[PDB]
Write a protein that binds this ligand. Sequence first.
Ligand SMILES: OC[C@H]1O[C@H](Oc2ccc(-c3ccccc3)cc2)[C@@H](O)[C@@H](O)[C@@H]1O
Length: 158
Amino acid sequence: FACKTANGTAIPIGGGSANVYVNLAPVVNVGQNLVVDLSTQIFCHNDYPETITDYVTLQRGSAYGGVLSNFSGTVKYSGSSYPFPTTSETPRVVYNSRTDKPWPVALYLTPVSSAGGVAIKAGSLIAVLILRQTNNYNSDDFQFVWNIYANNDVVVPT
Ligand SMILES: OC[C@H]1O[C@H](Oc2ccc(-c3ccccc3)cc2)[C@@H](O)[C@@H](O)[C@@H]1O
């Protein structure tokens, strides 16, 4: 089991970490969602589906910088919504193919009432998402750590 980003940055068998730089909607109003869809950014696969089944969860999702200070968050994992920053490990998504399958993670961030102006700074860390991978074959329990950075400023009109 291993993962890679859209630009081809890989995290190999055994886990590790990678930086993910994402484009954000430049203008987000109060009452609207800023959507950070990682399913277009992160792809994983099973290296031995003939014999092994892989289990993948969002173990933990943390908010940083402007997202932590200026947004109320929800994370959608494989069709279900949970608080973001997270309060528990999600259910599993099964990986049973050698063909790449997106990691079905999306952040839904809406501005808090106090937000206004540059709510996210370009180049700043906005989130850390931990993909936890196990299986039905051995004792492997690996973390794939995804550090999410903003490519641009995000303004909340006042
Ligand atoms: O995706 C599946 C797994 O791929 C890796 O582990 C193994 C472990 C054993 C074998 C193997 C076993 C018998 C004969 C030949 C190869 C192949 C892969 C490792 O990533 C792991 O966590 C992940 O569940």
